[PDB]
Design a protein around this ligand. Structure first.
Ligand SMILES: NC(=O)c1ccc[n+]([C@@H]2O[C@H](COP(=O)([O-])OP(=O)(O)OC[C@H]3O[C@@H](n4cnc5c(N)ncnc54)[C@H](O)[C@@H]3O)[C@@H](O)[C@H]2O)c1
Ligand SMILES: NC(=O)c1ccc[n+]([C@@H]2O[C@H](COP(=O)([O-])OP(=O)(O)OC[C@H]3O[C@@H](n4cnc5c(N)ncnc54)[C@H](O)[C@@H]3O)[C@@H](O)[C@H]2O)c1
Ligand SMILES: NC(=O)c1ccc[n+]([C@@H]2O[C@H](COP(=O)([O-])OP(=O)(O)OC[C@H]3O[C@@H](n4cnc5c(N)ncnc54)[C@H](O)[C@@H]3O)[C@@H](O)[C@H]2O)c1
Ligand SMILES: NC(=O)c1ccc[n+]([C@@H]2O[C@H](COP(=O)([O-])OP(=O)(O)OC[C@H]3O[C@@H](n4cnc5c(N)ncnc54)[C@H](O)[C@@H]3O)[C@@H](O)[C@H]2O)c1
Ligand SMILES: Nc1ncnc2[nH]cnc12
Ligand SMILES: Nc1ncnc2[nH]cnc12
Ligand SMILES: [K+]
Ligand SMILES: [K+]
Ligand SMILES: [K+]
Ligand SMILES: [K+]
Lengths: 462, 464, 460, 461
């Protein structure tokens, strides 16, 4: 009532968004357990959180948990295609500043992040950051250093964002401490892997409605996202080949039942067309990049792909695929939003019945969020319970108020303790109806642990 | 065979030719190990090493033994389990003039005698200076009964989770006398051997022991670590309906996401020692229970009383105390079907009716079932484990801890893992063995993610 | 051109883009276009068609037209139309009456608009049907039109069941081809199509994680087999119910636990017969039977809170949705997704936790909440349809003397040789390479080198 | 003083008996028939010549026939498939059996002849149980006067049925037969899931090879090829499938397999030039499943990747051209039923040669040659059908019919669906499965009786 501090696609989608939020709450027991456990204590009272992460229904439940624990927030999406417009509407209709819609331009994307940083044309009195991929973190460091003086910490969601934080820490340019939320086991080995198992084939079906069984796929990378992606396709009956630069991850792909190949003859990427294994790429119906690296589906690979192959990226940024080359050289025919046929016949127009085209999903942006709805609530429950715990921890540490000498001892990128990781996992397991066994005192003593945990040394890899 | 060689004890020396044929096949299945043989043979990095070895005397261990010897070592060998020796592998090693004391079906007394035969040569302590162990039994005997021998030993290379646990306990209590390498926690060990090894060999052992159809039946896997993960997959891929029990909620979370129902043998998960705490309805529908924990009494007497008639019971953890077989020896009548396959008749202790329907089938008397009823992990998986063992032996032997002054010794008394660069090099040879082709990063790409083109490719915190 | 009714004609260009993609996914259908274009074997055929107005059906429609036919089309379900497909067909000048979200009355009206042209019966001479609704209406309300119709080609198990019942009772007026029972239909479409599209529909409707949750699939025929795999491959813990012990044996061997909603399998009508403990652990129930009331009122009362309920058999009476309309309050989440509040009939608490989620109001969930089977699977079914249309149209049943009609009034399947030819085109579409028998090998197993390769008894 | 048998070692009898008692608890359909029909003795007076793999599972079948009143004389239908402890247990029970693991071809024929003849003259046989048609063929060729008094043949397997239908078509079949193979509780149980269980079993026992990550080529995708492909894919193999039947090939594609041919463009012109050498040079394991001849031929064998495993799970060993390998290459026995075939020539071999293939069971049925064949709970279905088929044909008494009636009943037929469903129900109950009973309204709705049959005869499952 008099609330205008937002920008969304269509505020009238709010009722729909709220209905899906209420369903999502029943799917996110770890997050709702934190809401119930901490609402009375208000651990985030006084926290003012700049948040930049995909404005989905799942993020909505995270935002309202932070608010329920006392926080104020100003929110944007971390991708131009990942917002669910009904989720953004519901958050805006609840009186929460949010600047996010599906299908932003790059200019609008930056404008949305700035609308969270600035309130009434001046820096918001922010003191906490929640980021997914590091874009908000980067803009604060380059453009708003005086704001970082008063920020107690950053809680970063994803592998690519953690890499950018560690880069800054090594260079001595990180200004506030951070929690690497990504490397909780209930994040990395849940969200990154099983989330992509759920949502990769989901997005490919919604975009193309292609049968996947019996066709050939090439997954580039076999980390947590590549593992999940490869399973998303293999469980549908695809014949999946895996590329990797890490021989340990390649070994896992072999033992998991995949053939390990390289787009390049003998794996040597020398920049020439002659290095492309044209015979291999000429049989591939679907290529998925999962690396967080640059140009792993390059222009020569795109030229060699089988006609009518699907091309998509599920890593954080779109530069995994050389989409710039395709914009320069080939004609783009939009099938529907976030589905384009790329005609390799040339740049100036195309025959509507041309058979030499590729299908690109979400213009090379994160395909699970761009062409579907990303990971499901019950998986994001784990990631976002860690986010809430990470926000509570850094806000209580009050880094910004410490003397310079004490700041120097606390400026780091850390993970949550294993005990908290286990407590998140336990709520997830109970959500499935699973029953964890309790060690007897004898058994606890025998393996050298407390009955309540933690159950594994910090070196353990699961 | 060296003239007059008698410094060994095996079941049947006439099996040596068969063993040698299978060793030649296994060399072709173990490219990381044979690649170390080719790379290091000329340089002889283990010349002067005298290795006491205690690990399952299989064909795969045979290839490991002859690699150590090819690099210059002398060895004296025993198995780390009474049922895990393949007698044709022991025979081939003995016929090569290598002291080995190992046969399938040892008694517990013979098991200790075999280890002592490695430790003693001609009635006196051998001048050993290295130890390779799997489970910590050889390490324990040296520390407890031959402590002076450890004054000359440069290090221990320990194969398995349970053995490392024991070493870390000694380190924490100040009782470990020599440095050790935790071979288990190489990724090309723990996340290869422990998981995929059990995936290959668990259903293999159950089939050899019982020839039971597995599809459509109910299994309960106790544990979901690396061995529990592989064991659950071994059974699920055969079409079993697999339930998983865990005390670790993170491992239980993985089990749920992997498609398993997570249950406890006890109502509400609370194990209070009473029959009343047993979920009798659950245990009464289980056809197969497998323990994978490395913990004690995780398949207890009341569980055994409540199990479905004719359920199979087995253990793939390192030691047999995962199952309360002592209870079964005390109370129930054992009928041997064939070696390492026993019907345990719950009707009472003395006799049994030949056609009684109320029995359980116990495999390998509760000892490691994959080695006891089949042949353990396959050569191509053991390749990674044993490449790491060889690298760990070279590293500790070269450090010469026993030759250091006491000040320098205190700095190096530790339990370490091999560096990630070596882990990656093992994996690369494994991938090539499959015909896999690893892509090489461009310089720009290596710069982009902050690694060298040659690796390592992951920070040490990475969990794979 | 105004002889159509679709939701939004401006969707035509989008639909045409997707038809052009679909053509590249349907090599068996497109091969028929190339093979028979010169003969025009359907020249003079006027086909009443009643089947889900999807992109895939669009390619079928345009294949029939390319071979000479005229058609007038409706959907066979109120929720299965893809509006852009309907628009693309309408924009090409083809009469079609179909949109997503019809009422039952509009559904009936649409079929009647195919039957009637300018207020009078169209001079139809062929029928293509999926489920038997158009066949039933013609027999009961327009029996005179069947005097000019040469045959029916029926798509699906439930439609074939209805044809055989009419044949047994002597009420079927024209011959028919059972398209369902070609192997490239029944063992492709019914099984693998549901494998692809069941989890697809559940994800689009609810975006629920499926891994780790408990499913109960009622039935294990072809649709039940594909449905169970759709869920198991996502990591659901799937239990299977069956009345047929052979199908139940297949479920056991395929790795599923076989259970009944009723204690000891005995459905005596009482709440006491419900296995409440089992139903109280089920997160998702899917009915696949073609039977009536296999998810009944007492089962719905006993289901775990917030379980998903859906049906992928042809008709919605597999679930007792009528009970739920009478007794419980429905909250629309979005089209084809309703929360059903077991707290009462009049109103509901917006935060109530005691509800079920029903998809597509109990109608075919794969078509109602997603897009049904993928083009490359429907290629097989619809190539059989085209061949079956050609065969019955060439037989010219309606022109035969009454004495010769009696000898041809039957329900038949296509011959195996054609089944194999459709399959080969599908295999080639994957890049598969079939081996050719040597003369000696062909003699050894007693087949011709070109096939057929199996006796008619073979079950694959 | 029972001496009417020949087995490897009678002292294995106690061990065989122990495994028989276990197997009875895994075979509820078959033991259900034992309990249901024991008092009635429906096979009293039956005298059955039996020729099928002398396994523990066959032991339970034999003792079921005996318990129902039959006498029998038994042999194995393959030289490597006998389990010596099962043969010993049967002989120790006083049942004539002539079978051991590792027969020569000459001994194989002698064993069958020992069942046909008793004390040097034709036994008074009146029933035949066969697996593959070898006993059936010898009777028709060499003992026609015995067939005059025989009421029928019950034939287990696809290849045996093919030989029966050829005889029927040529007018040479002398007695009616039941095609046991094509019961759904046989063909879609035994042929498929039995090979799923036992193919990777036999490969592990023979070689202990890791299968995960390696390349397999399965020739054929019928029931045996389907189950074999699953046996390897579930272990993590990368499985390619070859087929001549496009419908079976379509199934392989949709099941998630790549469909390939050993020959370029699928055309076998008999020369090396037609072999896809790039494909075969990548294959770690080839398995033949066809029932056809020379589907893994000499030119394929020459092109296979070094150290590939070659095996056959169809009924006869001519699926692989082992004759070519015997004529040209040197064989090194690793252990029984496992040979290295050195492609360096025929005159000796280097013990460390790298260019060899591994042949399992000398090309004979690999699941039975290198392991124990199908598990008891699967053979339960097959052998319940066998017992019922024996009962049906013995009760018909074809040999006593007048010539005019014989002509009307000389056929090869399958058991009715009601029997197939009742076998399946006992298998399901063995897993603890609970089948739902239709209500009268539901049975009416789909047009079936509450007790079944639930499907028309056309249904393919
Ligand atoms: N879309 C989603 O929902 C989602 C979820 C989590 C993470 N992510 C993003 O996905 C990316 C990967 O995340 P992760 O956790 O899997 O990282 P990771 O480090 O676990 O895996 C990346 C893998 O790519 C491999 N790789 C690098 N360059 C390669 C090349 N040229 N060819 C082949 N393989 C190559 C690396 O060896 C590594 O194993 C990141 O950008 C992350 O932020 C996306
Ligand atoms: N047989 C083989 O070939 C083989 C191979 C490798 C290791 N091992 C042995 O197997 C054992 C397990 O090794 P690992 O690497 O999997 O160790 P691990 O630590 O990875 O896993 C053991 C798991 O057991 C769980 N657990 C403990 N007590 C439990 C209880 N009471 N109920 C349920 N779950 C319980 C723990 O939470 C843990 O996740 C060790 O003894 C190891 O030495 C055997
Ligand atoms: N949605 C789709 O895309 C699609 C595709 C093909 C067919 N269908 C429809 O799906 C239905 C099933 O087709 P089908 O080809 O699988 O038929 P089917 O005869 O192969 O299978 C139906 C199965 O249900 C079982 N069944 C019957 N009543 C039961 C009960 N009370 N409890 C448990 N099981 C019971 C039967 O035993 C049978 O095995 C039909 O209505 C058919 O028209 C839908
Ligand atoms: N080992 C066992 O336990 C066991 C069990 C059952 C049957 N069998 C035997 O296995 C064989 C197969 O039986 P089935 O029931 O699977 O028969 P089937 O007719 O169902 O399948 C055989 C398949 O081989 C294919 N084929 C034929 N020639 C081919 C070629 N040159 N290349 C590729 N594919 C080719 C056919 O198209 C067919 O689909 C028979 O000999 C049968 O008696 C063995
Ligand atoms: N649904 C989702 N919401 C927010 N962040 C995500 N990352 C992946 N899936 C997501
Ligand atoms: N996509 C589709 N089109 C037409 N009929 C169908 N039946 C199932 N899926 C279908
Ligand atoms: K979602
Ligand atoms: K082994
Ligand atoms: K579709
Ligand atoms: K067996």
């Amino acid at each position: 009532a008099g609330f205008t501090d937002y920008k969304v696609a269509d505020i009238t989608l709010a009722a729909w968004g709220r209905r899906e939020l209420i369903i999502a709450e029943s799917e996110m027991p770890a997050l709702m357990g934190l809401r119930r456990k901490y609402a009375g204590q208000q651990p985030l009272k006084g926290a003012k959180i700049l948040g930049c992460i995909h404005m989905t229904i799942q993020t909505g439940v995270l935002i309202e948990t932070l608010v329920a624990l006392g926080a104020e927030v100003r929110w944007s999406s971390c991708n131009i295609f990942s917002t669910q417009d009904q989720a953004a509407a519901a958050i805006a209709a609840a009186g929460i500043p949010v600047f996010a819609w599906k299908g932003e331009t790059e200019e609008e994307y930056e404008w949305c992040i700035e609308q969270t940083i600035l309130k009434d044309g001046q820096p918001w009195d922010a003191n906490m950051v929640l980021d997914d991929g590091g874009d908000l973190t980067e803009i604060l460091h380059k453009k708003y250093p005086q704001m970082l003086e008063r920020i107690h910490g950053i809680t970063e969601e994803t592998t690519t964002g953690v890499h950018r934080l560690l880069d800054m820490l090594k260079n001595g340019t990180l200004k506030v401490p951070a929690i690497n939320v990504n490397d909780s086991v209930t994040k990395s080995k849940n969200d990154n892997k099983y989330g992509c198992r759920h949502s990769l084939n989901d997005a490919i079906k919604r975009g193309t409605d292609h049968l996947l069984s019996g066709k050939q796929a090439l997954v580039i990378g076999y980390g947590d996202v590549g593992k999940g992606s490869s399973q998303s396709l293999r469980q549908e009956g695809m014949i999946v080949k895996v590329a990797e630069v890490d021989p340990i991850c390649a070994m896992q792909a072999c033992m998991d039942g995949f053939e390990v190949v390289s787009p390049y003859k003998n794996g040597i990427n020398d920049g020439t067309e002659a290095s492309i294994d044209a015979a291999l790429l000429g049989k591939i119906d679907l290529i998925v990049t999962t690396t967080g690296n640059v140009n792993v589906c390059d222009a020569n690979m795109l030229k060699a792909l089988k006609k009518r192959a699907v091309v998509c990226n599920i890593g954080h940024f779109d530069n995994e695929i050389d989409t710039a080359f395709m914009r320069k050289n080939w004609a783009w025919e939009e099938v529907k939003p976030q589905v384009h046929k790329i005609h390799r016949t040339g740049k100036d127009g195309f025959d509507a019945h041309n058979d030499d085209y590729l299908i690109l999903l979400a213009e090379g942006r994160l395909v699970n969020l761009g062409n579907a709805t990303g990971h499901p609530s019950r998986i994001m429950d784990g990631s976002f319970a860690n986010q809430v715990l990470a926000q509570i921890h850094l806000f209580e540490q009050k880094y910004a108020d410490l003397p310079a000498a004490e700041k120097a001892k606390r400026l780091s990128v850390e993970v949550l303790p294993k005990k908290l990781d286990e407590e998140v996992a336990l709520e997830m397991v109970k959500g499935f109806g699973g029953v964890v066994t309790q060690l007897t005192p004898k058994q606890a003593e025998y393996i050298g642990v407390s009955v309540e945990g933690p159950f594994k040394p910090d070196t353990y890899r699961y």
